[PDB]
Each structure stands twice: as structure tokens, then as C-alpha cells.
Amino acid sequence: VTTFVALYDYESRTETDLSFKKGERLQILNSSEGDWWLAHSLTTGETGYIPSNYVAPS
Structure with missing residues (x-):
């Protein structure tokens, strides 16, 4: 998996x-x-680190 979805803001x-x-x-x-x-x-174009507990597979 290389594409994820955000579960929380x-x-x-x-x-x-x-x-x-x-x-x-x-x-x-x-x-x-x-x-x-x-x-x-992919949705907005910006880049950076994200907390891993905030995403799901996409």
C-alpha cells in the first residue's frame, strides 16, 4: 500500500x-x-510528516 486516506483532521x-x-x-x-x-x-499537493494512527488504506 502506497496510497492512504485520512481518518481525522x-x-x-x-x-x-x-x-x-x-x-x-x-x-x-x-x-x-x-x-x-x-x-x-494527492488531494492538495502539500508534503510532510503525518501521524500514522490517522490514516487508512486507499
């Missing part, structure tokens, strides 16, 4: 994380380990 608090809305679709190439994964929003 999240608002960035730093330069390295990514704000997204529930239902946004996110390309995540490495979901192997970590509580934070690098994501690219």
Missing part, C-alpha cells in the same frame, strides 16, 4: 508536518516503521 504545528482533512488521500511511500510517516497529499 490534523493541523501542522511545525515546518515538517502536514495539515490535512479527514478524507484527504495521501501518497506514503514508507509506512514500514515509525509513528510519523512522510506523506504527499
Whole structure:
């Protein structure tokens, strides 16, 4: 799986994380380990780390 869906809204608090809305679709190439994964929003075009407990497969 390389495309995920946001289950909850999240608002960035730093330069390295990514704000997204529930239902946004996110390309995540490495979901192997970590509580934070690098994501690219297909829905909006922005990029950054997201909390792994906030997404589902898409």
C-alpha cells in the first residue's frame, strides 16, 4: 500500500508536518516503521510528516 486516506483532521504545528482533512488521500511511500510517516497529499499537493494512527488504506 502506497496510497492512504485520512481518518481525522490534523493541523501542522511545525515546518515538517502536514495539515490535512479527514478524507484527504495521501501518497506514503514508507509506512514500514515509525509513528510519523512522510506523506504527499494527492488531494492538495502539500508534503510532510503525518501521524500514522490517522490514516487508512486507499
